[PDB]
Amino acid sequence: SMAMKATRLAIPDVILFEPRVFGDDRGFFFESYNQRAFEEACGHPVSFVQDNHSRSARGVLRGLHYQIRQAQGKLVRATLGEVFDVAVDLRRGSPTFGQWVGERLSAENKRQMWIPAGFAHGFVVLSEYAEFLYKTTDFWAPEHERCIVWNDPELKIDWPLQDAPLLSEKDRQGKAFADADCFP
Amino acid sequence: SMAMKATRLAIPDVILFEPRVFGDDRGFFFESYNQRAFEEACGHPVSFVQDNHSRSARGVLRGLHYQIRQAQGKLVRATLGEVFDVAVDLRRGSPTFGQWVGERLSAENKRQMWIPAGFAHGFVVLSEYAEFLYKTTDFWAPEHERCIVWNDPELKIDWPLQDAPLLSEKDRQGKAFADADCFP
């Protein structure tokens, strides 16, 4: 069925993609996205309207973000460095509501995650510096972004970390999972 | 067009040659290679810089070899015994990427295969002993040879075998087609 690997995770709708590479470390070529494979993989059509690119230093943790209005699916990867990327299922009635999955994505391993509408998203940087890019199905609007605090006790996420995250004020002020409005 | 038969296989760039023989089993003469016929057959110039000769016993399977750097076309035959020789297309964008073809080459049938740059190559010995020789367009460098495991499930190669291959450690440690770096 492919020519990039696709693997459903503990939470099935969340998918990990692995591009096939051609060439080697001194020259290589790879497909970072293929509408056909991606749609066959996720089982439905998708339109990406915005691409976002960011750079953040070791230990920066941007996180537990999601928009309830102007909801968005996100396809994320690391073109530089290594992050641990996390997805939380906040879908009304989901059998896996309140569950999370996480994976290391890096420029070396070239892995990506699709995180559908209805999930909260986050990552922490593990390398000296990380460059993160994602494609979304709708635009990032601050007036609509909610947040769940990274270190929430019930989610009890396994941050491969071992040093306090450098968080933004906003993310520090994150809501407790218990108090979090979730997705219809 | 000839005076050795040339036949394109299911994967067109891979060619099977059959020399015309003169004489018989108690004396015979045949042309194992003719720059002119070969170039007309394969459609472009070729230079061969190294010839390799090997002897291996029944069931030895040396395989799924290719070099991405110092890439090589290979023209192979059996001067003694019988092998089943296999070619796998690993060319970025090839319509037949991930496809394979195989043929029995022997000292008796005198058949040969041209396996261009961009393919992985392998053979298993079917006779008591086999002597294998090939001409390549660039030199065998171990520091560059990659390998796909002979019994890969997706390639699902039809090894006329019926007994476990005696493999080298290296070939045992072969990569899965899925994880294999391929040719730009």
Swiss-Prot record, chains A, B:
Amino-acid positions noted as binding substrate in the UniProt annotation, renumbered to this chain: R26, E31, Q50, D51, N52, R62, K74, H121, E145, K170
SUPFAM superfamilies given in the database record: RmlC-like cupins
Positions marked as site (Participates in a stacking interaction with the thymidine ring of dTDP-4-oxo-6-deoxyglucose): W140
UniProt keyword annotation of Lipid biosynthesis present: no
GO CC field: cytosol
Residues forming the catalytic site: H65 (proton acceptor), Y134 (proton donor)
GO biological process: dTDP-rhamnose biosynthetic process; lipopolysaccharide biosynthetic process; lipopolysaccharide core region biosynthetic process; polysaccharide biosynthetic process
Gene3D superfamilies, per the entry: Jelly Rolls (2.60.120.10)
Gene Ontology molecular-function annotations: dTDP-4-dehydrorhamnose 3,5-epimerase activity
Assigned keywords, A-Z: Carbohydrate metabolism, Isomerase, Lipopolysaccharide biosynthesis
Recorded coiled-coil stretches: none
Pathway(s) this gene product operates in, as recorded in its UniProt entry: Carbohydrate biosynthesis; dTDP-L-rhamnose biosynthesis; Bacterial outer membrane biogenesis; lipopolysaccharide biosynthesis
Its EC number(s): 5.1.3.13
Catalytic activity: dTDP-4-dehydro-6-deoxy-alpha-D-glucose = dTDP-4-dehydro-beta-L-rhamnose
Function of the molecule: Catalyzes the epimerization of the C3' and C5'positions of dTDP-6-deoxy-D-xylo-4-hexulose, forming dTDP-6-deoxy-L-lyxo-4-hexulose.
Family membership: Belongs to the dTDP-4-dehydrorhamnose 3,5-epimerase family.
Binding partners and assembly: Homodimer.
Name of the protein this chain belongs to: dTDP-4-dehydrorhamnose 3,5-epimerase
Record gene name: rmlC
